[PDB]
Write a protein that binds this ligand. Structure first.
Ligand code: WNX
Length: 109
């Protein structure tokens, strides 16, 4: 229970204006059609984004911190999986993930 409150604070920081310069591609689900990505859902079997994490947190769908962490890492992993390593969105994902991983590691154990 206390770990999920810490994860909620993590989610608020990831969504905060402080990180908007690199977090914004992850605010909403990838719209493959709008982005012209005809193969996105062939490659990415389980899409994830911060608005989906926020909904599941608000509706108390996560049973523990590890389930929350798996969704956030899935969001980043999808980005790395679909895109080349020098892509700008990959650089943004790495910057947001450093925020997530550091706050997550400070979780009371
Ligand atoms: C054509 O889209 C692609 O190639 C893959 C795609 N990319 C970018 C993106 C973001 C910032 C920059 C800066 C220069 N290029 C960029 C591309 C992108 C842009 C979005 O807008 C609302 C939403 C999702 C992504 N998104 C995620 C998440 N995971 N993959 C992608």
């Amino acid at each position: 229970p206390e770990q999920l409150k810490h994860c909620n604070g993590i989610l608020k920081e990831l969504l905060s204006k402080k990180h908007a310069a690199y977090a914004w591609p992850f605010y909403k689900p990838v719209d493959a059609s709008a982005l012209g990505l005809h193969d996105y859902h062939d490659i990415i079997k389980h899409p994830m984004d911060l608005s989906t994490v926020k909904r599941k947190m608000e509706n108390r769908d996560y049973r523990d911190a590890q389930e929350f962490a798996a969704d956030v890492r899935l969001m980043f992993s999808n980005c790395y999986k679909y895109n080349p390593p020098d892509h700008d969105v990959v650089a943004m994902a790495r910057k947001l993930q450093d925020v997530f991983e550091f706050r997550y590691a400070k979780m009371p154990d």
